[PDB]
mmCIF file of C-alpha atoms and ligand atoms in Angstrom:
data_model
loop_
_atom_site.group_PDB
_atom_site.id
_atom_site.type_symbol
_atom_site.label_atom_id
_atom_site.label_comp_id
_atom_site.label_asym_id
_atom_site.label_seq_id
_atom_site.Cartn_x
_atom_site.Cartn_y
_atom_site.Cartn_z
ATOM 1 C CA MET A 1 27.828 -5.058 -4.541
ATOM 2 C CA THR A 2 27.634 -1.671 -2.789
ATOM 3 C CA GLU A 3 24.681 -1.604 -0.383
ATOM 4 C CA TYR A 4 23.532 1.765 0.984
ATOM 5 C CA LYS A 5 21.572 1.870 4.256
ATOM 6 C CA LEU A 6 19.064 4.756 3.946
ATOM 7 C CA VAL A 7 16.519 5.786 6.592
ATOM 8 C CA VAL A 8 13.334 7.829 6.008
ATOM 9 C CA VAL A 9 12.245 9.845 9.074
ATOM 10 C CA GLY A 10 9.567 12.487 9.612
ATOM 11 C CA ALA A 11 6.216 13.128 11.252
ATOM 12 C CA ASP A 12 3.497 10.600 10.527
ATOM 13 C CA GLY A 13 1.453 11.313 7.418
ATOM 14 C CA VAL A 14 4.145 13.219 5.532
ATOM 15 C CA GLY A 15 4.530 10.383 2.988
ATOM 16 C CA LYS A 16 7.536 8.359 4.243
ATOM 17 C CA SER A 17 5.844 5.062 3.204
ATOM 18 C CA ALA A 18 4.443 6.481 -0.063
ATOM 19 C CA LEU A 19 7.876 7.847 -0.992
ATOM 20 C CA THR A 20 9.622 4.495 -0.292
ATOM 21 C CA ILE A 21 6.986 2.332 -2.067
ATOM 22 C CA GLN A 22 7.131 4.770 -5.006
ATOM 23 C CA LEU A 23 10.903 4.214 -5.340
ATOM 24 C CA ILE A 24 10.561 0.450 -4.708
ATOM 25 C CA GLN A 25 7.393 -0.610 -6.640
ATOM 26 C CA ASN A 26 6.945 2.528 -8.861
ATOM 27 C CA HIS A 27 3.391 3.010 -7.718
ATOM 28 C CA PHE A 28 1.643 5.539 -5.488
ATOM 29 C CA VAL A 29 0.200 3.803 -2.425
ATOM 30 C CA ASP A 30 -3.055 5.473 -1.317
ATOM 31 C CA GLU A 31 -3.250 3.504 1.926
ATOM 32 C CA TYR A 32 -0.324 2.400 4.059
ATOM 33 C CA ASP A 33 -0.508 1.363 7.716
ATOM 34 C CA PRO A 34 1.154 4.283 9.629
ATOM 35 C CA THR A 35 2.416 1.847 12.291
ATOM 36 C CA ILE A 36 4.368 -0.495 9.969
ATOM 37 C CA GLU A 37 8.135 0.138 10.039
ATOM 38 C CA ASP A 38 10.108 -2.038 7.577
ATOM 39 C CA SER A 39 13.203 -2.298 5.316
ATOM 40 C CA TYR A 40 12.967 -2.587 1.525
ATOM 41 C CA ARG A 41 15.811 -3.346 -0.909
ATOM 42 C CA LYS A 42 16.103 -2.133 -4.513
ATOM 43 C CA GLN A 43 18.846 -2.364 -7.134
ATOM 44 C CA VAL A 44 19.172 0.990 -8.896
ATOM 45 C CA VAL A 45 21.732 2.632 -11.174
ATOM 46 C CA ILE A 46 23.055 5.930 -9.817
ATOM 47 C CA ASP A 47 25.522 7.798 -12.044
ATOM 48 C CA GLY A 48 26.105 4.635 -14.097
ATOM 49 C CA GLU A 49 26.943 2.731 -10.890
ATOM 50 C CA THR A 50 24.611 -0.130 -10.015
ATOM 51 C CA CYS A 51 24.048 -0.457 -6.254
ATOM 52 C CA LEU A 52 21.603 -1.940 -3.711
ATOM 53 C CA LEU A 53 19.460 0.538 -1.760
ATOM 54 C CA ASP A 54 18.331 -0.684 1.667
ATOM 55 C CA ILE A 55 15.639 1.713 2.907
ATOM 56 C CA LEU A 56 14.219 1.782 6.416
ATOM 57 C CA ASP A 57 10.708 3.277 6.355
ATOM 58 C CA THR A 58 10.235 4.371 9.947
ATOM 59 C CA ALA A 59 6.892 4.509 11.715
ATOM 60 C CA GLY A 60 8.421 6.009 14.845
ATOM 61 C CA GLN A 61 7.256 4.100 17.935
ATOM 62 C CA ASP A 62 18.206 -0.660 16.467
ATOM 63 C CA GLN A 63 20.449 -2.548 14.030
ATOM 64 C CA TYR A 64 19.557 -0.178 11.182
ATOM 65 C CA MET A 65 19.846 3.193 12.960
ATOM 66 C CA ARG A 66 23.325 2.159 14.157
ATOM 67 C CA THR A 67 24.535 1.144 10.673
ATOM 68 C CA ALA A 68 22.498 3.692 8.652
ATOM 69 C CA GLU A 69 24.601 5.798 6.289
ATOM 70 C CA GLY A 70 22.104 8.430 5.096
ATOM 71 C CA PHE A 71 18.812 9.999 6.177
ATOM 72 C CA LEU A 72 15.801 11.399 4.352
ATOM 73 C CA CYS A 73 14.161 14.026 6.571
ATOM 74 C CA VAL A 74 10.627 14.445 5.284
ATOM 75 C CA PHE A 75 7.996 17.108 5.925
ATOM 76 C CA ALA A 76 4.832 17.815 3.959
ATOM 77 C CA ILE A 77 4.409 21.258 2.406
ATOM 78 C CA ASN A 78 0.743 21.262 3.480
ATOM 79 C CA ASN A 79 1.634 20.560 7.123
ATOM 80 C CA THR A 80 3.451 23.324 9.043
ATOM 81 C CA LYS A 81 3.657 21.097 12.166
ATOM 82 C CA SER A 82 5.664 18.372 10.368
ATOM 83 C CA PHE A 83 8.093 21.107 9.294
ATOM 84 C CA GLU A 84 8.374 22.347 12.916
ATOM 85 C CA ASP A 85 9.207 18.759 13.900
ATOM 86 C CA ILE A 86 12.240 18.595 11.554
ATOM 87 C CA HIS A 87 14.706 19.876 14.178
ATOM 88 C CA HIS A 88 13.650 17.046 16.525
ATOM 89 C CA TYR A 89 14.550 14.565 13.764
ATOM 90 C CA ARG A 90 17.876 16.209 12.929
ATOM 91 C CA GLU A 91 18.909 16.138 16.605
ATOM 92 C CA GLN A 92 18.043 12.404 17.064
ATOM 93 C CA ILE A 93 20.104 11.615 13.953
ATOM 94 C CA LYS A 94 23.239 13.503 15.111
ATOM 95 C CA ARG A 95 22.975 11.426 18.321
ATOM 96 C CA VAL A 96 22.342 7.930 16.921
ATOM 97 C CA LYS A 97 25.334 8.739 14.635
ATOM 98 C CA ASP A 98 27.432 10.678 17.198
ATOM 99 C CA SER A 99 28.491 13.097 14.435
ATOM 100 C CA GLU A 100 27.718 16.522 12.966
ATOM 101 C CA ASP A 101 28.392 15.321 9.400
ATOM 102 C CA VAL A 102 25.648 12.773 8.696
ATOM 103 C CA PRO A 103 24.650 12.577 4.970
ATOM 104 C CA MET A 104 21.117 13.959 5.024
ATOM 105 C CA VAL A 105 18.506 15.436 2.660
ATOM 106 C CA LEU A 106 15.563 17.668 3.596
ATOM 107 C CA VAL A 107 12.487 16.542 1.657
ATOM 108 C CA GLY A 108 9.305 18.599 1.240
ATOM 109 C CA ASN A 109 6.693 16.048 0.077
ATOM 110 C CA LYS A 110 3.071 16.569 -1.178
ATOM 111 C CA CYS A 111 4.218 19.177 -3.856
ATOM 112 C CA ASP A 112 1.294 18.123 -6.128
ATOM 113 C CA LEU A 113 -0.966 19.651 -3.427
ATOM 114 C CA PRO A 114 -2.233 23.232 -3.869
ATOM 115 C CA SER A 115 -2.692 23.860 -0.073
ATOM 116 C CA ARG A 116 1.008 24.784 0.713
ATOM 117 C CA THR A 117 1.691 26.169 4.224
ATOM 118 C CA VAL A 118 5.516 25.846 4.034
ATOM 119 C CA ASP A 119 7.270 27.772 1.237
ATOM 120 C CA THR A 120 10.440 26.724 -0.628
ATOM 121 C CA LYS A 121 12.292 29.663 0.874
ATOM 122 C CA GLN A 122 11.584 28.593 4.477
ATOM 123 C CA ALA A 123 12.845 25.076 3.757
ATOM 124 C CA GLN A 124 15.933 26.194 1.804
ATOM 125 C CA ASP A 125 16.849 28.406 4.785
ATOM 126 C CA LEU A 126 16.483 25.420 7.127
ATOM 127 C CA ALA A 127 18.426 23.161 4.738
ATOM 128 C CA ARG A 128 21.162 25.814 4.409
ATOM 129 C CA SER A 129 21.117 26.114 8.222
ATOM 130 C CA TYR A 130 21.984 22.406 8.331
ATOM 131 C CA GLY A 131 24.086 22.677 5.164
ATOM 132 C CA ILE A 132 22.106 19.881 3.493
ATOM 133 C CA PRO A 133 20.195 19.784 0.140
ATOM 134 C CA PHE A 134 16.471 20.546 -0.041
ATOM 135 C CA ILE A 135 14.385 18.589 -2.573
ATOM 136 C CA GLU A 136 10.639 19.011 -3.237
ATOM 137 C CA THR A 137 8.843 15.777 -4.064
ATOM 138 C CA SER A 138 5.495 14.196 -4.686
ATOM 139 C CA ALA A 139 5.076 10.493 -3.929
ATOM 140 C CA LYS A 140 1.965 10.586 -6.205
ATOM 141 C CA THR A 141 3.521 12.108 -9.399
ATOM 142 C CA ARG A 142 7.147 10.888 -8.901
ATOM 143 C CA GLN A 143 8.231 14.616 -8.692
ATOM 144 C CA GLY A 144 11.867 14.624 -7.313
ATOM 145 C CA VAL A 145 11.559 11.114 -5.930
ATOM 146 C CA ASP A 146 14.730 9.647 -7.535
ATOM 147 C CA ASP A 147 16.459 13.022 -6.971
ATOM 148 C CA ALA A 148 15.827 12.765 -3.193
ATOM 149 C CA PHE A 149 17.186 9.185 -2.772
ATOM 150 C CA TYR A 150 19.988 9.655 -5.398
ATOM 151 C CA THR A 151 21.054 13.007 -3.852
ATOM 152 C CA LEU A 152 21.364 11.158 -0.470
ATOM 153 C CA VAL A 153 23.384 8.405 -2.110
ATOM 154 C CA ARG A 154 25.640 11.096 -3.629
ATOM 155 C CA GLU A 155 26.056 12.716 -0.181
ATOM 156 C CA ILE A 156 27.066 9.308 1.251
ATOM 157 C CA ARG A 157 29.668 8.802 -1.511
ATOM 158 C CA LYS A 158 31.259 12.166 -0.621
ATOM 159 C CA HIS A 159 31.208 11.265 3.092
ATOM 160 C CA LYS A 160 32.803 7.830 2.512
ATOM 161 C CA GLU A 161 35.860 9.696 1.212
ATOM 162 C CA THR B 1 -28.017 1.061 1.765
ATOM 163 C CA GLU B 2 -26.670 -2.443 2.399
ATOM 164 C CA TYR B 3 -24.152 -3.908 -0.072
ATOM 165 C CA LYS B 4 -23.920 -7.740 -0.130
ATOM 166 C CA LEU B 5 -20.301 -8.544 -1.075
ATOM 167 C CA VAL B 6 -18.725 -11.994 -1.442
ATOM 168 C CA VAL B 7 -14.983 -12.753 -1.268
ATOM 169 C CA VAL B 8 -14.022 -15.875 -3.268
ATOM 170 C CA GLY B 9 -10.707 -17.442 -4.238
ATOM 171 C CA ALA B 10 -8.423 -20.391 -3.565
ATOM 172 C CA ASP B 11 -7.423 -21.465 -0.061
ATOM 173 C CA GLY B 12 -4.530 -19.362 1.243
ATOM 174 C CA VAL B 13 -4.915 -16.222 -0.910
ATOM 175 C CA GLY B 14 -5.918 -14.023 2.053
ATOM 176 C CA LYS B 15 -9.730 -13.872 1.825
ATOM 177 C CA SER B 16 -10.128 -13.791 5.657
ATOM 178 C CA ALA B 17 -7.137 -11.482 6.215
ATOM 179 C CA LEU B 18 -8.519 -9.039 3.630
ATOM 180 C CA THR B 19 -12.013 -9.013 5.210
ATOM 181 C CA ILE B 20 -10.787 -8.703 8.833
ATOM 182 C CA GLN B 21 -8.442 -5.920 7.690
ATOM 183 C CA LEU B 22 -11.399 -3.972 6.229
ATOM 184 C CA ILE B 23 -13.634 -4.784 9.229
ATOM 185 C CA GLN B 24 -11.328 -4.582 12.260
ATOM 186 C CA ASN B 25 -8.437 -2.592 10.704
ATOM 187 C CA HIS B 26 -5.787 -5.104 11.816
ATOM 188 C CA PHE B 27 -3.804 -7.852 10.040
ATOM 189 C CA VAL B 28 -4.826 -11.319 11.226
ATOM 190 C CA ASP B 29 -1.828 -13.688 10.956
ATOM 191 C CA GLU B 30 -3.910 -16.817 11.464
ATOM 192 C CA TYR B 31 -7.570 -17.442 10.781
ATOM 193 C CA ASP B 32 -9.176 -20.881 10.684
ATOM 194 C CA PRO B 33 -9.168 -21.753 6.919
ATOM 195 C CA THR B 34 -12.516 -23.537 7.322
ATOM 196 C CA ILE B 35 -14.547 -20.628 8.847
ATOM 197 C CA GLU B 36 -17.014 -19.096 6.343
ATOM 198 C CA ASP B 37 -18.794 -16.079 7.884
ATOM 199 C CA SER B 38 -20.534 -12.735 7.179
ATOM 200 C CA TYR B 39 -19.019 -9.536 8.644
ATOM 201 C CA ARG B 40 -20.869 -6.186 8.609
ATOM 202 C CA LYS B 41 -19.259 -2.714 8.656
ATOM 203 C CA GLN B 42 -20.745 0.776 8.320
ATOM 204 C CA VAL B 43 -18.403 2.717 6.027
ATOM 205 C CA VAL B 44 -18.618 6.042 4.155
ATOM 206 C CA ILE B 45 -18.066 5.664 0.379
ATOM 207 C CA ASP B 46 -18.246 8.765 -1.909
ATOM 208 C CA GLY B 47 -19.909 10.701 0.935
ATOM 209 C CA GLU B 48 -22.493 7.926 1.300
ATOM 210 C CA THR B 49 -22.857 6.099 4.603
ATOM 211 C CA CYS B 50 -23.550 2.432 3.696
ATOM 212 C CA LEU B 51 -23.606 -0.983 5.441
ATOM 213 C CA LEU B 52 -21.086 -3.386 3.845
ATOM 214 C CA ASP B 53 -22.018 -7.021 4.454
ATOM 215 C CA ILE B 54 -19.128 -9.333 3.467
ATOM 216 C CA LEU B 55 -19.373 -13.116 3.026
ATOM 217 C CA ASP B 56 -15.837 -14.483 3.594
ATOM 218 C CA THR B 57 -15.860 -17.862 1.806
ATOM 219 C CA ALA B 58 -13.899 -20.910 3.025
ATOM 220 C CA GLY B 59 -15.516 -23.326 0.624
ATOM 221 C CA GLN B 60 -17.718 -24.666 3.447
ATOM 222 C CA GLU B 61 -18.220 -28.440 3.047
ATOM 223 C CA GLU B 62 -20.885 -28.085 5.811
ATOM 224 C CA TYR B 63 -23.993 -25.887 6.238
ATOM 225 C CA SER B 64 -23.829 -22.075 6.084
ATOM 226 C CA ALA B 65 -27.148 -20.317 6.864
ATOM 227 C CA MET B 66 -25.593 -17.314 5.065
ATOM 228 C CA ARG B 67 -24.001 -18.487 1.773
ATOM 229 C CA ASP B 68 -27.251 -20.442 1.057
ATOM 230 C CA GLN B 69 -29.117 -17.076 1.076
ATOM 231 C CA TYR B 70 -26.027 -14.957 0.439
ATOM 232 C CA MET B 71 -25.390 -16.251 -3.115
ATOM 233 C CA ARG B 72 -29.072 -15.531 -3.823
ATOM 234 C CA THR B 73 -28.877 -11.921 -2.576
ATOM 235 C CA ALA B 74 -25.191 -11.171 -3.317
ATOM 236 C CA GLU B 75 -24.571 -8.073 -5.430
ATOM 237 C CA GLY B 76 -20.788 -8.016 -5.900
ATOM 238 C CA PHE B 77 -17.797 -10.370 -5.867
ATOM 239 C CA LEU B 78 -14.138 -10.007 -4.968
ATOM 240 C CA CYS B 79 -12.151 -12.591 -6.923
ATOM 241 C CA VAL B 80 -8.901 -12.965 -5.018
ATOM 242 C CA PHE B 81 -5.623 -14.590 -6.025
ATOM 243 C CA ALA B 82 -2.178 -14.178 -4.451
ATOM 244 C CA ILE B 83 0.638 -12.758 -6.588
ATOM 245 C CA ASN B 84 3.035 -15.370 -5.144
ATOM 246 C CA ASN B 85 0.713 -18.220 -6.150
ATOM 247 C CA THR B 86 0.350 -19.001 -9.874
ATOM 248 C CA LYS B 87 -2.139 -21.835 -9.113
ATOM 249 C CA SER B 88 -4.590 -19.531 -7.271
ATOM 250 C CA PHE B 89 -4.480 -17.301 -10.355
ATOM 251 C CA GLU B 90 -5.158 -20.284 -12.665
ATOM 252 C CA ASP B 91 -8.198 -21.017 -10.468
ATOM 253 C CA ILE B 92 -9.758 -17.573 -11.124
ATOM 254 C CA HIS B 93 -11.653 -18.732 -14.246
ATOM 255 C CA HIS B 94 -13.310 -21.481 -12.166
ATOM 256 C CA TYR B 95 -14.537 -18.805 -9.729
ATOM 257 C CA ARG B 96 -15.745 -16.409 -12.447
ATOM 258 C CA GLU B 97 -17.717 -19.189 -14.167
ATOM 259 C CA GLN B 98 -19.272 -20.452 -10.927
ATOM 260 C CA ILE B 99 -20.387 -16.866 -10.116
ATOM 261 C CA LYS B 100 -22.154 -16.321 -13.478
ATOM 262 C CA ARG B 101 -24.030 -19.640 -12.823
ATOM 263 C CA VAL B 102 -25.037 -19.051 -9.178
ATOM 264 C CA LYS B 103 -26.279 -15.598 -10.384
ATOM 265 C CA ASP B 104 -27.574 -16.648 -13.814
ATOM 266 C CA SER B 105 -26.134 -13.474 -15.386
ATOM 267 C CA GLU B 106 -23.298 -12.195 -17.590
ATOM 268 C CA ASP B 107 -23.203 -8.793 -15.838
ATOM 269 C CA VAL B 108 -22.142 -9.446 -12.239
ATOM 270 C CA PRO B 109 -20.283 -6.534 -10.516
ATOM 271 C CA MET B 110 -16.879 -8.073 -9.868
ATOM 272 C CA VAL B 111 -13.278 -7.045 -9.067
ATOM 273 C CA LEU B 112 -10.090 -9.058 -9.638
ATOM 274 C CA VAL B 113 -7.799 -8.786 -6.579
ATOM 275 C CA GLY B 114 -4.112 -9.714 -6.463
ATOM 276 C CA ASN B 115 -3.292 -10.001 -2.739
ATOM 277 C CA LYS B 116 0.076 -10.274 -0.834
ATOM 278 C CA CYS B 117 1.521 -7.580 -3.106
ATOM 279 C CA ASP B 118 3.829 -6.893 -0.013
ATOM 280 C CA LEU B 119 5.736 -10.105 -0.882
ATOM 281 C CA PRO B 120 8.831 -10.006 -3.185
ATOM 282 C CA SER B 121 8.270 -13.617 -4.423
ATOM 283 C CA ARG B 122 5.752 -12.669 -7.184
ATOM 284 C CA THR B 123 4.695 -15.494 -9.590
ATOM 285 C CA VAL B 124 1.979 -13.429 -11.331
ATOM 286 C CA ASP B 125 2.827 -10.083 -12.929
ATOM 287 C CA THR B 126 0.527 -7.038 -13.169
ATOM 288 C CA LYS B 127 0.096 -7.479 -16.955
ATOM 289 C CA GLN B 128 -1.236 -11.074 -16.797
ATOM 290 C CA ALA B 129 -3.898 -9.979 -14.260
ATOM 291 C CA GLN B 130 -4.883 -6.780 -16.136
ATOM 292 C CA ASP B 131 -5.261 -8.952 -19.296
ATOM 293 C CA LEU B 132 -7.451 -11.431 -17.400
ATOM 294 C CA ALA B 133 -9.420 -8.560 -15.804
ATOM 295 C CA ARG B 134 -9.827 -6.871 -19.237
ATOM 296 C CA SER B 135 -10.967 -10.240 -20.720
ATOM 297 C CA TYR B 136 -13.756 -10.132 -18.094
ATOM 298 C CA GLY B 137 -13.993 -6.332 -18.411
ATOM 299 C CA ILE B 138 -13.606 -5.860 -14.650
ATOM 300 C CA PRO B 139 -11.097 -3.790 -12.585
ATOM 301 C CA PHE B 140 -7.813 -5.231 -11.276
ATOM 302 C CA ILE B 141 -6.571 -4.038 -7.867
ATOM 303 C CA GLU B 142 -3.327 -5.116 -6.128
ATOM 304 C CA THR B 143 -3.642 -5.377 -2.356
ATOM 305 C CA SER B 144 -1.901 -6.452 0.791
ATOM 306 C CA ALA B 145 -3.977 -7.516 3.793
ATOM 307 C CA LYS B 146 -0.788 -6.967 5.832
ATOM 308 C CA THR B 147 -0.064 -3.287 4.846
ATOM 309 C CA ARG B 148 -3.709 -2.146 4.023
ATOM 310 C CA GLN B 149 -2.459 -1.301 0.494
ATOM 311 C CA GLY B 150 -5.349 -1.089 -1.934
ATOM 312 C CA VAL B 151 -7.755 -2.771 0.538
ATOM 313 C CA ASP B 152 -10.282 0.115 0.613
ATOM 314 C CA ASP B 153 -9.685 0.534 -3.120
ATOM 315 C CA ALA B 154 -10.732 -3.087 -3.758
ATOM 316 C CA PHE B 155 -13.899 -3.019 -1.669
ATOM 317 C CA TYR B 156 -14.894 0.545 -2.610
ATOM 318 C CA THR B 157 -14.381 -0.163 -6.328
ATOM 319 C CA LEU B 158 -16.732 -3.148 -6.005
ATOM 320 C CA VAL B 159 -19.354 -0.981 -4.297
ATOM 321 C CA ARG B 160 -18.989 1.551 -7.147
ATOM 322 C CA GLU B 161 -19.489 -1.237 -9.733
ATOM 323 C CA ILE B 162 -22.698 -2.292 -7.913
ATOM 324 C CA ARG B 163 -23.970 1.326 -7.950
ATOM 325 C CA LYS B 164 -23.452 1.449 -11.739
ATOM 326 C CA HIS B 165 -25.214 -1.910 -12.161
ATOM 327 C CA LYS B 166 -28.222 -0.824 -10.054
ATOM 328 C CA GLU B 167 -28.870 1.863 -12.683
HETATM 329 N N1 LIG C 201 -1.394 14.026 -2.717
HETATM 330 C C1 LIG C 201 -0.408 13.391 -2.068
HETATM 331 N N2 LIG C 201 -0.704 12.541 -1.084
HETATM 332 C C2 LIG C 201 0.405 11.950 -0.584
HETATM 333 C C3 LIG C 201 1.724 12.138 -0.936
HETATM 334 N N3 LIG C 201 2.566 11.361 -0.146
HETATM 335 C C4 LIG C 201 1.736 10.719 0.656
HETATM 336 N N4 LIG C 201 0.413 11.040 0.438
HETATM 337 C C5 LIG C 201 -0.783 10.587 1.136
HETATM 338 O O1 LIG C 201 -0.740 11.075 2.466
HETATM 339 C C6 LIG C 201 -1.221 10.050 3.378
HETATM 340 C C7 LIG C 201 -0.166 9.757 4.414
HETATM 341 O O2 LIG C 201 1.013 9.258 3.754
HETATM 342 P P1 LIG C 201 1.860 8.009 4.283
HETATM 343 O O3 LIG C 201 2.793 7.597 3.226
HETATM 344 O O4 LIG C 201 0.921 6.960 4.818
HETATM 345 O O5 LIG C 201 2.654 8.630 5.570
HETATM 346 P P2 LIG C 201 3.790 8.257 6.660
HETATM 347 O O6 LIG C 201 3.267 8.214 8.067
HETATM 348 O O7 LIG C 201 4.889 9.308 6.544
HETATM 349 O O8 LIG C 201 4.263 6.869 6.248
HETATM 350 C C8 LIG C 201 -1.701 8.882 2.495
HETATM 351 O O9 LIG C 201 -3.095 9.029 2.263
HETATM 352 C C9 LIG C 201 -0.892 9.067 1.201
HETATM 353 O O10 LIG C 201 -1.441 8.562 -0.002
HETATM 354 C C10 LIG C 201 2.025 13.030 -1.991
HETATM 355 O O11 LIG C 201 3.134 13.336 -2.428
HETATM 356 N N5 LIG C 201 0.873 13.626 -2.511
HETATM 357 N N1 LIG C 202 2.466 -11.455 3.119
HETATM 358 C C1 LIG C 202 1.134 -11.579 3.172
HETATM 359 N N2 LIG C 202 0.585 -12.646 3.765
HETATM 360 C C2 LIG C 202 -0.766 -12.604 3.742
HETATM 361 C C3 LIG C 202 -1.575 -11.609 3.236
HETATM 362 N N3 LIG C 202 -2.913 -11.936 3.397
HETATM 363 C C4 LIG C 202 -2.890 -13.093 4.005
HETATM 364 N N4 LIG C 202 -1.622 -13.553 4.249
HETATM 365 C C5 LIG C 202 -1.284 -14.813 4.899
HETATM 366 O O1 LIG C 202 -1.674 -15.851 4.028
HETATM 367 C C6 LIG C 202 -2.258 -16.955 4.766
HETATM 368 C C7 LIG C 202 -3.655 -17.212 4.255
HETATM 369 O O2 LIG C 202 -4.484 -16.070 4.569
HETATM 370 P P1 LIG C 202 -6.029 -16.284 4.898
HETATM 371 O O3 LIG C 202 -6.714 -14.976 4.974
HETATM 372 O O4 LIG C 202 -6.152 -17.234 6.062
HETATM 373 O O5 LIG C 202 -6.515 -16.964 3.522
HETATM 374 P P2 LIG C 202 -7.878 -17.596 2.909
HETATM 375 O O6 LIG C 202 -7.575 -19.083 2.955
HETATM 376 O O7 LIG C 202 -7.988 -17.069 1.486
HETATM 377 O O8 LIG C 202 -9.032 -17.188 3.738
HETATM 378 C C8 LIG C 202 -2.107 -16.568 6.246
HETATM 379 O O9 LIG C 202 -0.822 -16.996 6.675
HETATM 380 C C9 LIG C 202 -2.058 -15.040 6.196
HETATM 381 O O10 LIG C 202 -1.361 -14.442 7.266
HETATM 382 C C10 LIG C 202 -0.990 -10.465 2.637
HETATM 383 O O11 LIG C 202 -1.575 -9.503 2.121
HETATM 384 N N5 LIG C 202 0.404 -10.538 2.644
HETATM 385 CL CL1 LIG C 203 17.235 10.000 20.983
HETATM 386 CL CL1 LIG C 204 27.682 20.285 -2.075
HETATM 387 MG MG1 LIG C 205 4.257 4.855 6.928
HETATM 388 MG MG1 LIG C 206 -10.363 -17.971 5.303
HETATM 389 NA NA1 LIG C 207 2.771 -19.999 -1.971
#
């Protein structure tokens, strides 16, 4: 069965662990140790194809990063600094993958929050700069959560051929 | 405000890991199964600074200067099973019944905890526990001592049940 190796990267506190646990256990985790980096597997159905998602939830202190096929690059919309940090993440990815075409999705998490400091336009301009999709999500409400992971899986499928 | 909390449950469910996690904010891999002790922590709950005193049970077959006077002063109980341990779950009724008797009451502030929710080998599903917890009319919270998931939720919910019971 087709196993996808997905990595979630981003500044700490943007919701990398909440996003993953949401997809895995379908619950919003209020508290999750920021230091715990781990892999989680889930069988999903994406476009009528069943597959196994292997997700590395990074805590950012390399079997996975060498075999990884797709990246979620996560900022929080209430956290300008995390957004500023995105370029750092993009650059590390292009290196660990020695390529300029790595399947990648820009994720703006915490979209249930009213205190936005990063607008959709800013992030679409970044995502267009990279030529990747932008998806707005909330780990707490499930907004765009499947869309983010499934859009990455769809990017991988294009890249495989 | 001091809250006197007791953690009860079968051997191996993570009573000591849960407590140490709340107290010292780290996951203890090994803790002597036989050590029953009280741990104090100043926390802020709902804007209220409060001293949480926690009696971590080990089913002491010896003397415990605390449980002797703890069970007489105790205000709130965590009833802990592990989700990968059907037997520990089956044991919950035993614990609930023993509590009502040591406290000679039908209204003891109490929370049902399903620990080691980080494990994929679950033998007790959310519904079974919510049905047990509803039978007792208490909250169910799923936790992992290892990831901190729901740990503050469990303890803070118990403190909130106590506050309701006090008035
Ligand atoms: N309101 C809200 N809080 C979120 C969201 N995602 C994560 N959080 C919270 O933000 C905090 C940090 O998230 P966490 O997943 O631990 O961050 P990480 O370092 O990227 O793994 C926690 O208190 C989460 O519950 C979200 O979409 N909405
Ligand atoms: N995976 C997992 N293991 C846990 C968790 N809590 C405790 N453990 C382990 O389970 C065992 C029993 O935990 P302990 O706190 O000593 O249990 P007690 O006998 O109820 O006091 C130890 O190996 C702990 O490391 C948890 O949340 N997740
Ligand atoms: Cl690097
Ligand atoms: Cl496209
Ligand atoms: Mg995390
Ligand atoms: Mg113990
Ligand atoms: Na077991």
